[PDB]
Amino acid sequence: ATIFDVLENHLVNQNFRQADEETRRLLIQISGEAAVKRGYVFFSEVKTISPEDLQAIDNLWIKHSDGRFGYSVQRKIWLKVKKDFTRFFVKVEWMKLYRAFPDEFKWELNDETPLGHLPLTNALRGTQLLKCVLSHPAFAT
Amino acid sequence: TTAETATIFDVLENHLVNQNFRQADEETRRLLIQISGEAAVKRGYVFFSEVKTISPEDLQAIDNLWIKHSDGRFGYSVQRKIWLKVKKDFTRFFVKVEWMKLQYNYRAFPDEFKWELNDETPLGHLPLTNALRGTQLLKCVLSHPAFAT
Incomplete structure (x- = not known):
């Protein structure tokens, strides 16, 4: 058995909200x-996370989203936008640019x-x- | 072996007495889920539709703890007051409580949230x-009957 089994079940079932929550817990778990x-998680512990655990989570999100979800995809968008988080949040549609945030996050794909x-x-x-997650060695290309 | 004498708010209370607001915030996040069913x-x-099912004694217990150990500067009741003052405009509210700001130096969110009082x-x-x-x-939290005037 692996610790990513529950996340996998959520991803297989396209239950992205529950998968997001399980990913939040997994990040804490793999941090010590x-x-x-x-x-x-302290941001200083992310460098101590093993790349095999981070790649496990990322590969699951990639496999069950046709490559449209995951930390790898977010890193690429982040680079494309010059590592400007404000522009990043607009591009991945977590905020706008007045209603900064929506009433409800859209969890469907x-x-x-x-x-x-x-x-x-x-x-x-x-x-x-x-x-620190997007610039972890796990996601070097 | 005794029956449980601890209450569900004890861990939060201990964190606030020790002025450990980061831990208290994290514990407040779990309590909201807990008191929701x-x-x-x-x-x-929590589904936002479950908030009405929260008993007002639980929300007031959490709020009063935050008020008691912050000299009235923290808590949902205080945030409600700021929120009403701003006509329920969440963006203006987020700026006033400093959760976001509106040459390569602009930060909508900080590098690190400031947890100190x-x-x-x-x-x-x-x-x-x-x-x-x-x-x-x-x-739904800020307009729960628990915080009505």
């Missing part, structure tokens, strides 16, 4: 016992869904955590 | 609610 205990729309990372706590 | 606990997040901390800065999942959940 200290992160699990306090319930969130259809034709209008932009690349990298998922997984969602809580950038209200600070962009540095997202910055 | 077994279904919300199971899936790990000092002189520069704005009213209602905490607790933090993930509005990226949608503004509707925070709206």
Whole structure:
């Protein structure tokens, strides 16, 4: 058995909301016992995450989204936008540019869904955590 | 072996007494899911339609703890007051509580959220609610009958 089995089941069933939540817990889990205990990840622990765990999560999101979801896709959009997180959030449609945020996040995968729309990372706590995930060696090309 | 004498708000209270607001915020996130029912606990997040089913004593318990240990500068009731003052405009509310800002230096969100309670901390800065999942959940919390005047 692997620790990604529940995430996989959610992804197979196209249950992207539950998959997003399981990805939030998985990120904490693969970051160490200290992160699990306090319930969130210090951005300084992301470099200690093994690339095999991060690639497991990313490959699952890629496989079950036709390559339109995952951290790898988000890194490419992020580079394409000069690593400007503000422009990144607009491009993946987590905010606009007045209604900054929608009433409800759209969790479905259809034709209008932009690349990298998922997984969602809580950038209200600070962009540095997202910055360390996208620039992890796991996602070097 | 005794019956459980702990209450569900004890861990949050201990964090606030120790002024550990980052831990308190994270614990407040779990409590909202917990006080929302077994279904919300199971899936790990709250449907905004379940907020009306939250008992007002639980929400006021959480709010009063945040008020008591922040000199009235933190809590849902305080955020409600700011929210009404701004005609329920969430964008203007997010700017006032400093969850976002509006030459290669512009940061909509900071590198790191500031969890401290000092002189520069704005009213209602905490607790933090993930509005990226949608503004509707925070709206049902801030307008729950628990915080009616």
